[PDB]
Design an enzyme around this catalytic site. Structure first.
Site, PDB file in Angstrom:
ATOM      1  N   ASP A  24       0.731  -1.224   0.057  1.00  0.00           N
ATOM      2  CA  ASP A  24      -0.020   0.154  -0.020  1.00  0.00           C
ATOM      3  C   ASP A  24       0.788   1.278   0.008  1.00  0.00           C
TER       4      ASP A  24
ATOM      5  N   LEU B 195     -18.984   4.419 -24.002  1.00  0.00           N
ATOM      6  CA  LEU B 195     -19.060   3.684 -24.847  1.00  0.00           C
ATOM      7  C   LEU B 195     -19.897   4.462 -25.978  1.00  0.00           C
TER       8      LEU B 195
ATOM      9  N   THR C 253      -7.192   3.730  -1.807  1.00  0.00           N
ATOM     10  CA  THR C 253      -6.761   2.301  -1.581  1.00  0.00           C
ATOM     11  C   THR C 253      -8.015   1.269  -2.167  1.00  0.00           C
TER      12      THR C 253
HETATM   13  C1  LIG Z   1     -15.403  -2.057 -18.709  1.00  0.00           C
HETATM   14  O1  LIG Z   1     -15.978  -3.485 -18.437  1.00  0.00           O
HETATM   15  C2  LIG Z   1     -17.102  -3.668 -18.160  1.00  0.00           C
HETATM   16  C3  LIG Z   1     -17.593  -5.489 -18.087  1.00  0.00           C
HETATM   17  O2  LIG Z   1     -17.235  -6.062 -19.268  1.00  0.00           O
HETATM   18  C4  LIG Z   1     -18.175  -3.156 -19.074  1.00  0.00           C
HETATM   19  O3  LIG Z   1     -19.422  -3.079 -18.423  1.00  0.00           O
HETATM   20  C5  LIG Z   1     -20.538  -4.089 -19.052  1.00  0.00           C
HETATM   21  O4  LIG Z   1     -21.252  -3.391 -19.926  1.00  0.00           O
HETATM   22  C6  LIG Z   1     -22.511  -3.826 -20.374  1.00  0.00           C
HETATM   23  C7  LIG Z   1     -23.267  -2.686 -21.205  1.00  0.00           C
HETATM   24  O5  LIG Z   1     -23.164  -1.535 -20.602  1.00  0.00           O
HETATM   25  C8  LIG Z   1     -23.275  -4.298 -19.174  1.00  0.00           C
HETATM   26  O6  LIG Z   1     -24.479  -5.320 -19.951  1.00  0.00           O
HETATM   27  C9  LIG Z   1     -25.721  -4.970 -19.382  1.00  0.00           C
HETATM   28  O7  LIG Z   1     -26.013  -5.815 -18.374  1.00  0.00           O
HETATM   29  C10 LIG Z   1     -27.270  -5.757 -17.756  1.00  0.00           C
HETATM   30  C11 LIG Z   1     -27.259  -6.727 -16.483  1.00  0.00           C
HETATM   31  O8  LIG Z   1     -26.088  -6.518 -15.901  1.00  0.00           O
HETATM   32  C12 LIG Z   1     -25.856  -7.637 -14.650  1.00  0.00           C
HETATM   33  O9  LIG Z   1     -25.345  -8.717 -14.791  1.00  0.00           O
HETATM   34  C13 LIG Z   1     -24.042  -8.822 -15.184  1.00  0.00           C
HETATM   35  C14 LIG Z   1     -23.129 -10.066 -15.414  1.00  0.00           C
HETATM   36  O10 LIG Z   1     -22.815 -10.827 -14.313  1.00  0.00           O
HETATM   37  C15 LIG Z   1     -23.135  -7.791 -13.777  1.00  0.00           C
HETATM   38  O11 LIG Z   1     -21.792  -7.597 -14.122  1.00  0.00           O
HETATM   39  C16 LIG Z   1     -24.005  -6.418 -13.745  1.00  0.00           C
HETATM   40  O12 LIG Z   1     -23.388  -5.720 -12.764  1.00  0.00           O
HETATM   41  C17 LIG Z   1     -23.568  -4.437 -12.510  1.00  0.00           C
HETATM   42  O13 LIG Z   1     -24.625  -3.816 -11.820  1.00  0.00           O
HETATM   43  C18 LIG Z   1     -24.439  -4.350 -10.458  1.00  0.00           C
HETATM   44  C19 LIG Z   1     -25.823  -3.993  -9.686  1.00  0.00           C
HETATM   45  O14 LIG Z   1     -26.998  -4.732 -10.130  1.00  0.00           O
HETATM   46  C20 LIG Z   1     -23.284  -3.476  -9.807  1.00  0.00           C
HETATM   47  O15 LIG Z   1     -22.970  -4.202  -8.759  1.00  0.00           O
HETATM   48  C21 LIG Z   1     -21.874  -3.733 -10.726  1.00  0.00           C
HETATM   49  O16 LIG Z   1     -21.101  -3.061 -10.139  1.00  0.00           O
HETATM   50  C22 LIG Z   1     -22.184  -3.575 -12.118  1.00  0.00           C
HETATM   51  O17 LIG Z   1     -22.745  -2.061 -12.264  1.00  0.00           O
HETATM   52  C23 LIG Z   1     -22.047  -1.269 -13.303  1.00  0.00           C
HETATM   53  O18 LIG Z   1     -22.791  -1.678 -14.508  1.00  0.00           O
HETATM   54  C24 LIG Z   1     -24.002  -1.425 -14.705  1.00  0.00           C
HETATM   55  C25 LIG Z   1     -24.454  -1.680 -16.069  1.00  0.00           C
HETATM   56  O19 LIG Z   1     -24.884  -3.106 -16.034  1.00  0.00           O
HETATM   57  C26 LIG Z   1     -24.285   0.234 -14.740  1.00  0.00           C
HETATM   58  O20 LIG Z   1     -25.520   0.338 -14.313  1.00  0.00           O
HETATM   59  C27 LIG Z   1     -23.652   0.898 -13.212  1.00  0.00           C
HETATM   60  O21 LIG Z   1     -23.577   2.152 -13.112  1.00  0.00           O
HETATM   61  C28 LIG Z   1     -22.110  -0.020 -12.952  1.00  0.00           C
HETATM   62  O22 LIG Z   1     -21.205   0.880 -13.872  1.00  0.00           O
HETATM   63  C29 LIG Z   1     -25.398  -6.744 -13.566  1.00  0.00           C
HETATM   64  O23 LIG Z   1     -25.945  -7.260 -12.335  1.00  0.00           O
HETATM   65  C30 LIG Z   1     -28.324  -6.096 -19.049  1.00  0.00           C
HETATM   66  O24 LIG Z   1     -29.574  -6.214 -18.331  1.00  0.00           O
HETATM   67  C31 LIG Z   1     -28.099  -4.974 -19.893  1.00  0.00           C
HETATM   68  O25 LIG Z   1     -29.115  -5.405 -20.917  1.00  0.00           O
HETATM   69  C32 LIG Z   1     -30.080  -4.152 -21.572  1.00  0.00           C
HETATM   70  O26 LIG Z   1     -29.379  -3.460 -22.482  1.00  0.00           O
HETATM   71  C33 LIG Z   1     -29.468  -3.808 -23.625  1.00  0.00           C
HETATM   72  C34 LIG Z   1     -28.590  -3.050 -24.769  1.00  0.00           C
HETATM   73  O27 LIG Z   1     -28.230  -3.624 -25.890  1.00  0.00           O
HETATM   74  C35 LIG Z   1     -30.989  -4.277 -24.078  1.00  0.00           C
HETATM   75  O28 LIG Z   1     -30.879  -4.803 -25.565  1.00  0.00           O
HETATM   76  C36 LIG Z   1     -31.537  -5.184 -23.173  1.00  0.00           C
HETATM   77  O29 LIG Z   1     -33.010  -5.473 -23.407  1.00  0.00           O
HETATM   78  C37 LIG Z   1     -31.431  -4.632 -21.812  1.00  0.00           C
HETATM   79  O30 LIG Z   1     -32.212  -3.525 -21.401  1.00  0.00           O
HETATM   80  C38 LIG Z   1     -26.682  -5.065 -20.381  1.00  0.00           C
HETATM   81  O31 LIG Z   1     -26.414  -6.197 -21.380  1.00  0.00           O
HETATM   82  C39 LIG Z   1     -22.583  -5.129 -18.229  1.00  0.00           C
HETATM   83  O32 LIG Z   1     -23.383  -5.313 -17.251  1.00  0.00           O
HETATM   84  C40 LIG Z   1     -21.442  -4.361 -17.635  1.00  0.00           C
HETATM   85  N1  LIG Z   1     -20.759  -4.981 -16.775  1.00  0.00           N
HETATM   86  C41 LIG Z   1     -20.068  -4.612 -15.582  1.00  0.00           C
HETATM   87  C42 LIG Z   1     -19.294  -5.424 -14.784  1.00  0.00           C
HETATM   88  O33 LIG Z   1     -20.279  -3.454 -15.194  1.00  0.00           O
HETATM   89  C43 LIG Z   1     -18.122  -1.781 -19.109  1.00  0.00           C
HETATM   90  O34 LIG Z   1     -18.834  -1.118 -20.461  1.00  0.00           O
HETATM   91  C44 LIG Z   1     -16.487  -1.417 -19.615  1.00  0.00           C
HETATM   92  N2  LIG Z   1     -16.287   0.010 -19.776  1.00  0.00           N
HETATM   93  C45 LIG Z   1     -15.660   0.402 -20.942  1.00  0.00           C
HETATM   94  C46 LIG Z   1     -15.417   1.943 -20.896  1.00  0.00           C
HETATM   95  O35 LIG Z   1     -15.236  -0.081 -21.722  1.00  0.00           O
HETATM   96  N1  LIG Z   2      -5.646  -8.245  -6.544  1.00  0.00           N
HETATM   97  C1  LIG Z   2      -5.603  -7.845  -5.356  1.00  0.00           C
HETATM   98  C2  LIG Z   2      -5.896  -7.589  -3.924  1.00  0.00           C
HETATM   99  C3  LIG Z   2      -4.635  -8.295  -3.135  1.00  0.00           C
HETATM  100  C4  LIG Z   2      -4.587  -7.991  -1.774  1.00  0.00           C
HETATM  101  C5  LIG Z   2      -5.588  -7.179  -1.036  1.00  0.00           C
HETATM  102  C6  LIG Z   2      -5.478  -6.901   0.280  1.00  0.00           C
HETATM  103  C7  LIG Z   2      -6.391  -6.160   0.775  1.00  0.00           C
HETATM  104  C8  LIG Z   2      -6.340  -5.758   2.428  1.00  0.00           C
HETATM  105  O1  LIG Z   2      -5.977  -6.940   3.338  1.00  0.00           O
HETATM  106  N2  LIG Z   2      -6.629  -4.766   2.955  1.00  0.00           N
HETATM  107  C9  LIG Z   2      -6.804  -3.539   2.088  1.00  0.00           C
HETATM  108  C10 LIG Z   2      -7.949  -2.764   2.056  1.00  0.00           C
HETATM  109  C11 LIG Z   2      -8.462  -1.873   3.429  1.00  0.00           C
HETATM  110  C12 LIG Z   2      -7.030  -0.813   3.654  1.00  0.00           C
HETATM  111  N3  LIG Z   2      -7.477  -0.437   5.074  1.00  0.00           N
HETATM  112  C13 LIG Z   2      -7.093   0.916   5.662  1.00  0.00           C
HETATM  113  O2  LIG Z   2      -7.338   1.177   6.942  1.00  0.00           O
HETATM  114  C14 LIG Z   2      -6.211   1.951   5.048  1.00  0.00           C
HETATM  115  C15 LIG Z   2      -5.063   1.864   4.392  1.00  0.00           C
HETATM  116  C16 LIG Z   2      -4.245   2.962   3.702  1.00  0.00           C
HETATM  117  C17 LIG Z   2      -5.002   4.177   3.748  1.00  0.00           C
HETATM  118  N4  LIG Z   2      -4.585   5.409   2.638  1.00  0.00           N
HETATM  119  N5  LIG Z   2      -5.888   6.308   3.035  1.00  0.00           N
HETATM  120  N6  LIG Z   2      -6.825   5.689   3.814  1.00  0.00           N
HETATM  121  C18 LIG Z   2      -6.408   4.259   4.040  1.00  0.00           C
HETATM  122  C19 LIG Z   2      -6.933   3.189   4.697  1.00  0.00           C
HETATM  123  C20 LIG Z   2      -7.863  -1.488   5.740  1.00  0.00           C
HETATM  124  C21 LIG Z   2      -8.282  -2.571   4.939  1.00  0.00           C
HETATM  125  C22 LIG Z   2      -7.661  -3.760   5.101  1.00  0.00           C
HETATM  126  C23 LIG Z   2      -6.380  -4.477   4.458  1.00  0.00           C
HETATM  127  C24 LIG Z   2      -6.699  -6.663  -1.821  1.00  0.00           C
HETATM  128  C25 LIG Z   2      -6.558  -6.854  -3.351  1.00  0.00           C
HETATM  129 CA   LIG Z   3      -3.560   2.575  -0.466  1.00  0.00          CA
HETATM  130 CA   LIG Z   4     -22.549   6.033 -24.293  1.00  0.00          CA
HETATM  131 ZN   LIG Z   5      -3.361   5.937   2.405  1.00  0.00          ZN
END
Ligand SMILES: *[C@@H]1O[C@H](CO)[C@@H](O[C@@H]2O[C@H](CO)[C@@H](O[C@@H]3O[C@H](CO[C@H]4O[C@H](CO)[C@@H](O)[C@H](O[C@H]5O[C@H](CO)[C@@H](O)[C@H](O)[C@@H]5O[C@H]5O[C@H](CO)[C@@H](O)[C@H](O)[C@@H]5O)[C@@H]4O)[C@@H](O)[C@H](O[C@H]4O[C@H](CO)[C@@H](O)[C@H](O)[C@@H]4O)[C@@H]3O)[C@H](O)[C@H]2NC(C)=O)[C@H](O)[C@H]1NC(C)=O
Ligand SMILES: N#Cc1ccc(/C=C/C(=O)N2CC[C@@H]3CN(C(=O)c4ccc5[nH]nnc5c4)C[C@@H]3CC2)cc1
Ligand SMILES: [Ca+2]
Ligand SMILES: [Ca+2]
Ligand SMILES: [Zn+2]
Ligand SMILES: [Cl-]
EC number: 3.1.4.39
Length: 804
Positions: A121, A689, A159
């Site tokens: 870290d 995108l 972090t």
């Molecule tokens: C970087 O890389 C990532 C990963 O490849 C890209 O992100 C992907 O982009 C596509 C298109 O935008 C997404 O597809 C859509 O998916 C939904 C359903 O998605 C669910 O299932 C997947 C698969 O396991 C999960 O990963 C999703 O998780 C998201 O939401 C949860 C909360 O539920 C959250 O905890 C996660 O962080 C994650 O959130 C992030 O992404 C979502 C977008 O889904 C966004 O809202 C949020 O702000 C966060 O950034 C999720 O549980 C599906 O329903 C969609 O279909 C609809 O659209 C199409 C359009 O064609 C229609 O035809 C259709 O009818 C539907 O209406 C999409 O297919 C994909 O989820 C997403 N994955 C992730 C992990 O984010 C990025 O685009 C990349 N970025 C760049 C810049 O390149």
């Molecule tokens: N790939 C991968 C990968 C490998 C190892 C890991 C291991 C993850 C892990 O054990 N830790 C990381 C996440 C947080 C960091 N932390 C802090 O208190 C904290 C540190 C520096 C800061 N600077 N400013 N605020 C700060 C706050 C507590 C907690 C437990 C220790 C996570 C991901």
């Molecule tokens: Ca850190």
């Molecule tokens: Ca766009």
């Molecule tokens: Zn720090």
């Protein structure tokens, strides 16, 4: 409640996790306050220290000891790491010569070389050189393995966002962990360092390496460690796990060090008190490398030495306060520090206007040490907008400074000399990467890369298939001795049209006048040759881009330039041209100032029109190929075609005109000719995108002409700049930007001055990877070169940072 009177006997640091209300014995039981009563007794032995002494050799096993120097210890797999050194006259790993690892040297039952992630870290990149005299182990790793001069973290350089980016290859906006401190509006909940909330799985999106591992039948050690577990106990625990029977022994592990981040916060990046934590990290690496040597694994395991971010000099007196800019300072919630994020204090408030807040914060002091942005206007390279946990208002803070709300928030909420979290291109935030092992390369330097890329590689190192992520798979193949992944170009989805002369002047009703009725056998076949594409190999140096979505478009050839013109968006998707070093700049002749000519190759129905630009008083227009760089007065008329034309706010034309008239030529001079590809970008929903035709939020008034949110350019030349761009024999050099198409220049506080004092400064701030532009356009560049695809992927991930 937890019934904590179960026992840890024979369960010390178990890999599976038993759920409430049974007690726990794993490395996170402490952080959940649910270890069994005997945990500290059984699993956290400390007696006799961490090192074998001369007298301890072949002792009688004493189960109370933290580690053992007894004869059975190699078998029980719990010797102190220096057991071989003292007792069996073996050398420390660090004292052994660097010998290449041509093939894995693993003991029987090991189906694959294991991976150890050693995460440190706050390990600022410049420590590798500045502290090298006191880190001999780490220096052996570096110089014997594969290393980059530094690795670029994600924004914010905090972090949690960075450690989870490492584990997923995703941007924070995508994995959900957009800060150490977050408010989610849909949860009405707040994620913070102290509290239980952060343990709910609902915050953590994406698929982290260890889940990816499990689901594919590779067993994983638990990555996170509780703070109270000392670092020496962490290493022996990884070593004990490695002694487990084949069927229960994980293939991937993580170690974490709070140092040097912890000290760096107290003493600054280079405080004299920093030498020791660095000494201690090195010791811990030594211990691990010794432990591996004992186990016959030091030439079998791939070790990754990686940091989450760097460390900058920050002190209390360098704080800017919002209360010195705002009156309504109690209407807002500020998430403070090395980056600012603003929102309303209550959404039961309709009189909350972000514009007033932004305005009140813009260029208000000549010295100002931050700059406000709406999140969609943040540089596109930061990818810090597409999440509801990211507040609409963002403050980007000057390196070395803090943003707080009121002065009381600092004196009643100096204690620190160091911090981090600034823009990820800032030098002091860069961190480290070294890879050492049979799968890495021997004594190999690699160019700097982004932390988002490592997930793919780690998946490779483990024979896994990566979950969909933001790395570009194959772009780090040059780190590895042997590759699980052979990357292949995506197929073109849309093939172009090649329109000839199909329409007559009078079929057009565009409201576009030009003085072009100025007027051979020789030189009338020749310009026709140009429209057939005879100078194409000159202006299209790397083959035409591929369109990776279904759409309707035409390739249009000209003397000076070449375009892929979209019948849907009524403007080119891309415009390619080479400016050689000797090429000359010229002006738009007085009579052609307002010239716009119909294109006889393209139907009236698929063309823009000057009438709309007349009627929209917010909206003027500009050109993608610059008239200023025409090869000849005749050729210049090509640049005024309706099909070269794109909408541009007057404010933006200032930036664009300067770019086209001055900088393109300057670049061609310094770099020995440049190839330029420029185009519109449409990303109204700021997801990074391309938006589809039916997602356009803004049209030039009274037309179907969509307004871009950004304009990009990709500027390429020969890496060896003794060769002209158009005759490069080897590796290429590129730089790119994605300029925000904005109706004002409020971003640039110097904009009332001459373009030579602010414009290039704006463009540098908005630098980009070719790959960022690819996501935004749905194009695929560099399809035809003499270079390997791997090399081209690397090229596509390059970001020109303009730091010293
Ligand atoms: C970087 O890389 C990532 C990963 O490849 C890209 O992100 C992907 O982009 C596509 C298109 O935008 C997404 O597809 C859509 O998916 C939904 C359903 O998605 C669910 O299932 C997947 C698969 O396991 C999960 O990963 C999703 O998780 C998201 O939401 C949860 C909360 O539920 C959250 O905890 C996660 O962080 C994650 O959130 C992030 O992404 C979502 C977008 O889904 C966004 O809202 C949020 O702000 C966060 O950034 C999720 O549980 C599906 O329903 C969609 O279909 C609809 O659209 C199409 C359009 O064609 C229609 O035809 C259709 O009818 C539907 O209406 C999409 O297919 C994909 O989820 C997403 N994955 C992730 C992990 O984010 C990025 O685009 C990349 N970025 C760049 C810049 O390149
Ligand atoms: N790939 C991968 C990968 C490998 C190892 C890991 C291991 C993850 C892990 O054990 N830790 C990381 C996440 C947080 C960091 N932390 C802090 O208190 C904290 C540190 C520096 C800061 N600077 N400013 N605020 C700060 C706050 C507590 C907690 C437990 C220790 C996570 C991901
Ligand atoms: Ca850190
Ligand atoms: Ca766009
Ligand atoms: Zn720090
Ligand atoms: Cl302006």
């Amino acid at each position: 409640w937890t019934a904590t009177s179960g026992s840890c006997k024979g369960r010390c640091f178990e890999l599976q996790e038993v759920g409430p209300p049974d007690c726990r014995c794993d490395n996170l039981c402490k952080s959940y306050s649910s270890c069994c009563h005997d945990f500290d007794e059984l699993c956290l032995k400390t007696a006799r220290g961490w090192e074998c002494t001369k007298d301890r050799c072949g002792e009688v096993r004493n189960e109370e000891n933290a580690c053992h120097c007894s004869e059975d210890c190699l078998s029980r797999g719990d010797c102190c790491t220096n057991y071989q050194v003292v007792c069996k006259g073996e050398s420390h790993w660090v004292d052994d010569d660097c010998e290449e690892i041509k093939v894995p040297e693993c003991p029987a039952g090991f189906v694959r070389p294991p991976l150890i992630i050693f995460s440190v870290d706050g390990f600022r990149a410049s420590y590798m050189k500045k502290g090298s005299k006191v880190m001999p182990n780490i220096e052996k790793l570096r110089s014997c393995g594969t290393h980059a001069p530094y690795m670029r973290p994600v924004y914010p350089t905090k972090t949690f966002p960075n450690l989870y980016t490492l584990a997923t290859g995703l941007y924070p906006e995508s994995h959900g962990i957009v800060g150490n401190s977050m408010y989610d509006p849909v949860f009405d909940a707040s994620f913070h360092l102290r509290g239980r909330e952060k343990f709910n799985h609902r915050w953590w999106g994406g698929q982290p390496l260890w889940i990816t591992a499990t689901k594919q039948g590779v067993r994983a050690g638990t990555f996170f460690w509780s703070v109270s577990i000392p670092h020496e106990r962490r290493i022996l625990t990884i070593l004990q796990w490695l002694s487990l029977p084949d069927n229960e022994r994980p293939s991937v592990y993580a170690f974490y060090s709070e140092q040097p981040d912890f000290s760096g916060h107290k003493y600054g990046p280079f405080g004299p008190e920093m030498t020791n934590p660095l000494r201690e990290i090195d010791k811990t690496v030594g211990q691990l490398m010794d432990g591996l040597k004992q186990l016959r694994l030091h030439r079998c395991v791939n070790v990754i030495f990686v940091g989450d971010h760097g460390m900058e000099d920050v002190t209390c007196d360098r704080t800017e306060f919002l209360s010195n800019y705002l009156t309504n300072v109690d209407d807002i919630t500020l998430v403070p520090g090395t980056l600012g994020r603003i929102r309303a204090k209550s959404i039961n408030n309709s009189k909350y206007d972000p514009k007033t807040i932004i305005a009140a914060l813009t260029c208000k002091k000549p010295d100002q040490h931050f700059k406000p942005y709406m999140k969609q206007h943040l540089p596109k390279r930061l990818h810090y907008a597409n999440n509801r946990r990211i507040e609409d208002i963002h403050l980007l803070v000057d390196r070395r400074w803090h943003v707080a709300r009121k002065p009381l928030d600092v004196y009643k909420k100096c204690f620190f000399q160091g911090d981090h979290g600034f823009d990820n291109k800032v030098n002091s935030m860069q961190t480290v990467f070294v890879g050492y092992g049979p799968t890495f390369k021997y004594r190999t330097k690699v160019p700097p890369f982004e932390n988002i890329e490592l997930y793919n590689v780690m998946c490779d190192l483990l024979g896994l298939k990566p979950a969909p992520n933001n790395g570009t798979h194959g772009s780090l193949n040059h780190l590895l001795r042997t590759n699980t992944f052979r990357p292949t170009m995506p197929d073109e989805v849309s093939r172009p049209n090649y329109p000839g002369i199909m329409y007559l002047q009078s079929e057009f009703d565009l409201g576009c006048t030009c003085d072009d009725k100025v007027e051979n056998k020789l030189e009338e076949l020749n310009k026709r040759l140009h429209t057939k594409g005879s100078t194409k190999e000159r202006h299209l140096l790397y083959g035409r881009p591929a369109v990776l979505y279904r759409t309707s478009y035409d390739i249009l050839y000209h003397t000076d330039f070449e375009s892929g013109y979209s019948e849907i968006f009524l403007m080119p998707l891309w415009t390619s041209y080479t400016i050689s070093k000797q090429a000359e700049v010229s002006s738009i002749p007085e009579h052609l100032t307002n010239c716009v000519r119909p294109d006889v190759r393209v139907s009236p129905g698929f063309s823009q029109n000057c009438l709309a630009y007349k009627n929209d008083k917010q909206m003027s227009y500009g050109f993608l190929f610059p008239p200023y760089l025409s090869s000849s007065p005749e050729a210049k008329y090509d640049a005024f075609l309706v099909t070269n034309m794109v909408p541009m706010y007057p404010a933006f034309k200032r930036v664009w005109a300067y770019f086209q008239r001055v900088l393109v030529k300057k670049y061609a001079s310094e770099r020995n000719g440049v190839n330029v590809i420029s185009g519109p970008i449409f990303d109204y929903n700021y997801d990074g995108l391309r938006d589809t035709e039916d997602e356009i939020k803004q049209y030039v008034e009274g037309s179907s002409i969509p307004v871009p949110t950004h304009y990009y350019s990709i500027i390429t030349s020969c890496l060896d700049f003794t060769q002209p761009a158009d005759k490069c024999d080897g590796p290429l050099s590129v730089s790119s930007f994605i300029l925000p198409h904005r109706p004002d220049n409020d971003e640039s506080c110097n904009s009332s001055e001459d373009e030579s004092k602010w414009v290039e400064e704006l463009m540098k701030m908005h630098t980009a990877r070719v790959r960022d532009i690819e996501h935004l356009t749905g194009l695929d560049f560099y399809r035809k070169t003499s270079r390997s695809y791997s090399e081209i992927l690397t090229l596509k991930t390059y970001l020109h940072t303009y730091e010293s």
